[PDB]
Nucleic acid binder design. Sequence first.
RNA 1: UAGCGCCGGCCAACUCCGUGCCAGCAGCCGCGGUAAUACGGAGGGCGCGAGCGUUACCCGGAUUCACUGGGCGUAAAGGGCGUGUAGGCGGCCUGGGGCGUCCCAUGUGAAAGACCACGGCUCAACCGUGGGGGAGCGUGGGAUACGCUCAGGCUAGACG
RNA 2: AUGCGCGCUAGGUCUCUGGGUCUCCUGGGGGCCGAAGCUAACGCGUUAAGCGCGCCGCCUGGGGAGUACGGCCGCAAGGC
Lengths: 100, 138, 124, 55, 208, 150
Amino acid sequence: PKKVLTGVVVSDKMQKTVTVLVERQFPHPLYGKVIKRSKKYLAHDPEEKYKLGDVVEIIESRPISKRKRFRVLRLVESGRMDLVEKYLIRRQNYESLSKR
Amino acid sequence: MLTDPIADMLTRIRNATRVYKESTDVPASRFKEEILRILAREGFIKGYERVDVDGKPYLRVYLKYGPRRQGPDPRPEQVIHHIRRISKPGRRVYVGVKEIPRVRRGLGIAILSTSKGVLTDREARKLGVGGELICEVW
Amino acid sequence: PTINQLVRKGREKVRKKSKVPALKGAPFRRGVCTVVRTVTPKKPNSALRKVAKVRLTSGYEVTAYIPGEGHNLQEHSVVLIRGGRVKDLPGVRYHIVRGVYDAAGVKDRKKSRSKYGTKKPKEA
Amino acid sequence: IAVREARKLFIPVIALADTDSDPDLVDYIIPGNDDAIRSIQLILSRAVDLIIQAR
Amino acid sequence: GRYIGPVCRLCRREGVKLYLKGERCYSPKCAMERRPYPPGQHGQKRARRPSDYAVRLREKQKLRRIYGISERQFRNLFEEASKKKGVTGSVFLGLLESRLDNVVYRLGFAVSRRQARQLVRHGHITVNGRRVDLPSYRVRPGDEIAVAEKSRNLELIRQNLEAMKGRKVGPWLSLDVEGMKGKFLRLPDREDLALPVNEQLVIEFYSR
Amino acid sequence: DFEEKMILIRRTARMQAGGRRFRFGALVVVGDRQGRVGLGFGKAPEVPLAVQKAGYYARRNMVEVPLQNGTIPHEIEVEFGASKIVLKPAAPGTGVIAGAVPRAILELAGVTDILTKELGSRNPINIAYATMEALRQLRTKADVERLRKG
RNA sequence: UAGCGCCGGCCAACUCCGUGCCAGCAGCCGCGGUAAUACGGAGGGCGCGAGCGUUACCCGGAUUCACUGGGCGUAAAGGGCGUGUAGGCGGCCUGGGGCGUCCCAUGUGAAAGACCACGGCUCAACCGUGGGGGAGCGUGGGAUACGCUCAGGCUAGACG
RNA sequence: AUGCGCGCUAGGUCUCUGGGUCUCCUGGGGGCCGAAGCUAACGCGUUAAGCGCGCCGCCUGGGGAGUACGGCCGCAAGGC
Ligand SMILES: [Zn+2]
């Protein structure tokens, strides 16, 4: 079977492309505590019918570009903006982490 | 704030036991009462009942001790010597059927929250299921 | 520390440091003796310990020790260095294998011949 | 001190303990007054009479 | 090879009547009947209390010298027994008694374990009608340990087997004296052997 | 009637008006290899008197040990000060795996097979006391049932 | 053919000579300035044995990076103090989902190595033939106690 | 020389500040003795250094050394 992931759209600033943040939980190898991680996947959409703060579902596909290997299957839930601003604030905190 | 109710209940039981009280009160909960019934069945506590305290649901626990000892320090031997909490918030402990611990060569009990209700180690082994490891008592 | 702290930072593994850096991870090095000088022990001990100064096949040049009763170590002797450190002498970290290259086994040993390399004495 | 010594040698302790006493160190306890000579006399007299009768 | 040299010195050092030298250690010459103190210049002085390590080492050495095998072989046998199932001591004692030389000694073909070793090495002994010439050979229950047809007329075996007439062999062994052949029945028990060794000390020694 | 065993002789000194005055202390274990153990610590100006006092103390202070198959019913770990001991049951044919002090104490108990580990501080006196406490804190199936079920 | 190390405590093995802080030994503690079981040689003894020692490296002992299994008043260790972002964690009662979690079947987890059993080299090393075990990850199904999520309520936390 | 928050575990005594039906009960704050308990000990003990939970910050022998190099912040001395 082909791998299927679920995440929230966090970007639409590209032509026929969206950025999906896939969320994963797993127990730590050593300390046993359940650890939560995330990864960003560039997904292909020809219809531009997906927007920011949309919970979508992706599938493994043949390569489209250098970083694109996934297509969008189905919209699950819409308007989940909270995750989007969470990601944006986490990303925006970086400017305050510089040295110079 | 209060982060762990079950750990709180264990600590309350331990503290009341160490001072040889006849009774202790803990805020009421289904999970707590299940743990209490499991403890009572194995004969670790005299009994429990649901009481009402100032318009709030409470569970009153009756503690059990041994006979008054001879010589200096005549305080009775405890029935609950040691009660730890295994799976804590921030580190959950899960065990399979093959990984259910044996406590004090079966002189103690390990209480599991299995898919088929809250069971002891013995019942969990017999039924052949695992779950969150709550506490060990001996 | 908390489990979260251990996840975020973890525990660091302790690193051992070699006490014989001149060997460069070898049991023995062949060197050439330069200076044969006697020196004194640290404090409670008082003697005239014989010490060589050797330049090895490595880039290093370290003080050695000469074990036994008598030696024939010259200012140009080619000798094999060894591990082991002398507690008394402050700076030596190496011994010399007696009877390998230029050095010879200390004469008329009869008890411990594996050390201080000497042939089995012929009895008649 | 006497109570402690009696504990050490497994000798049962009988006491006319009062408010400021420790009940645990006493096996057979008479909760009453240890002052007010009247009470002491009453308890000791009764006990001694029982001892004499029980010979 | 094995230990070659004086014998009853070991009798003295261990301080127990070790039956190593055949018959002389039966007659009043075992060096236990006379001068029973350990050998050496200080053999007859007041000995200090032995250490735990001393006691365990002495026990192990005594047990090993009873059978007279290499320390390496002893270690290997101990490891094999430990890795097996059951009681370590019992299994170890059973395995030590399965040696061909020891079995030959037990049957009475020889007067000593060393003589039995020599007889085995020289090919005088046969197992299941096949020549075996290895002291360390392990036998199994239901094996025929007999003398070769060539060696049957030897004076040594003759006197050995005539002197065994009306003499009771170990319960786990059955001997057909007239047929010059024997049988291995079962692994010997702890109680069967009258060894002056407490194997617990051996286990404790090898534990460290 | 009872076996005696020696742990340590230690010589302590107290200063005086320009001089050193010595005293001897002995740790002694007394048992019968049937389940009774006694440990005594005696201080006396001389070694014989120290040994005698330690023997006396051990004879007075005795503990019953609930053996079965020459081993301990259940595992235990006890901390006495900065020293921790661990005791575990063992299968027959294991031997007493212990340090000098725990081995000596458990030998006179009749214990044949046990696994032990010395943790924290390794003061012989404290280790001995911890071992004694651990032996004092052992329960059988019968005792547990009598406590719980009644 | 019988050798090699060791005999102060760890750690099993003790006397006589030469020696006089010299020659020297040493892994640690340390031993040696005329009565050395510590140096050198003998006799004796202990351990291993066609091997015995030495050096280099790794693990253990080290619970001395501690998840199993540590600590921070005075031993090394509470930030000079607040507010607060990300993150971590989280009251009581019901219901839906089954992501974590648990269970069953199944695919994989090559061979060789590890384990058990039986066999072939006269034994063993070595090898052969069978049988299991196996962390993990797919795939189908089952459970809902505890985490998660969602929906509806409660006032014991918090706020007004 | 004791991070914060919450819960449980005998009391006695002196104070500051409220409320009530005012010899007393009931809250909050600051001291001194001391149950159980804890600690290597001194000692702590309902204002825990006790029994627990969550999060954070630090420790891994003594010197060399809060030094050198590199970086950041200051007019500088200097600070991290
Ligand atoms: Zn003999």
